[PDB]
Design a binder for this molecule. Sequence first.
Ligand SMILES: *[C@@H]1O[C@H](CO)[C@@H](O[C@@H]2O[C@H](CO)[C@@H](O[C@@H]3O[C@H](CO)[C@@H](O)[C@H](O[C@H]4O[C@H](CO)[C@@H](O)[C@H](O)[C@@H]4O[C@H]4O[C@H](CO)[C@@H](O)[C@H](O)[C@@H]4O)[C@@H]3O)[C@H](O)[C@H]2NC(C)=O)[C@H](O)[C@H]1NC(C)=O
Ligand code: NAG
Lengths: 96, 119
Amino acid sequence: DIQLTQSPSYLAASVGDRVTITCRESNDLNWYLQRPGKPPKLLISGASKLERGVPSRFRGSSSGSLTISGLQPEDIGTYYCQVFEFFGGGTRVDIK
Amino acid sequence: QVHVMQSGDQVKKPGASVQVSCTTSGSSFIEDSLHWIQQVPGQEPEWLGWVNPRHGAVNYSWKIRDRITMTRDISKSTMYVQMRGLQSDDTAMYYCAKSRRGANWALYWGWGTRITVSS
Ligand SMILES: *[C@@H]1O[C@H](CO)[C@@H](O[C@@H]2O[C@H](CO)[C@@H](O[C@@H]3O[C@H](CO)[C@@H](O)[C@H](O[C@H]4O[C@H](CO)[C@@H](O)[C@H](O)[C@@H]4O[C@H]4O[C@H](CO)[C@@H](O)[C@H](O)[C@@H]4O)[C@@H]3O)[C@H](O)[C@H]2NC(C)=O)[C@H](O)[C@H]1NC(C)=O
Ligand SMILES: *[C@@H]1O[C@H](CO)[C@@H](O)[C@H](O)[C@H]1NC(C)=O
C-alpha cells in the first residue's frame, strides 16, 4: 500500500532549538502527541489549521512535517504522524 | 469542553467475550463518527473499527472481522464494543476515540481501557 518515509526517531534537543520531524509522503499530515499513561492529545489536524488550546509554535509543513521552533516541557512525548485509517512510524523525544 | 469517558480495566481468561462502554459529553452525538483502536505499548496503534451513530453503519478492519461488534445509543450517546473469540495475542491497550465533524482521524482519546488475558 502506502508506507511513509519517516526520519530516524531519536533527538537530543532539550530547550529552545528548532527541530523538525520528516513524514515525507502525499498529503493532511495529522500529528498527535502520545502521553505516558495519560490520554494522548492531538497536536495538529490538516497540517495547517491549528485548534484551540495548542501552542502557536506547532507548525506543519503542508504536504511534508511538524517543524517546531523549540522544545518545551509541555510538548515532550512521542509524536505520531497518522494518515486517512493507516499510521506513520512514530518519533519519541526526550530531554538530555 | 467536550470530553469522552470509558469504563475501567478488566482481566479475564482468553476465549471469553469482552464488552466495553464509552460515552461522550459536551457535544452533539448523532453526527460524529466514533472509532475504536488498540495498540501494543511502545509500538504503532492499529485501527480496529469505526461507527456512525447517525444511522448505525459500522466498518471493521482486516484482522478484527468476525470478532467485533459495535453498537451505538445516541439516546444515551453511549457506544458498546463487544469482541468474541478472544485470542492470546491481544493483551494490549485500547482507546475509544472520537472524531469531530464525523470526518476521518480522531481528536479526543479515552481514559485508557486495559483489556488483558493471561495464560
Ligand atoms: C452580567 O454579565 C456576567 C458576566 O458576563 C454574567 O455572569 C455570567 O452568567 C453566566 C450565565 O449565568 C455564567 O455562565 C455559566 O457559568 C456556569 C459556571 O461556570 C456554567 O455552569 C454555565 O454553563 C451551563 O449553562 C449553559 C447555559 O447558560 C450551558 O450551555 C452549559 O452547557 C452548562 O449547562 C450544563 O450545566 C447546567 C447546570 O449544571 C445544566 O442545567 C445543563 O443541563 C448542562 O448540563 C454557564 O457557562 C457565567 O459564569 C457568569 N460569569 C460570572 C463571572 O459569574 C451575569 O449573569 C450578567 N448579568 C445578568 C443579569 O445576566
Ligand atoms: C424506546 O423503546 C425501544 C424499544 O424498547 C428502545 O429500543 C429505545 O431505546 C427506546 N427509545 C428511547 C427513548 O430510548
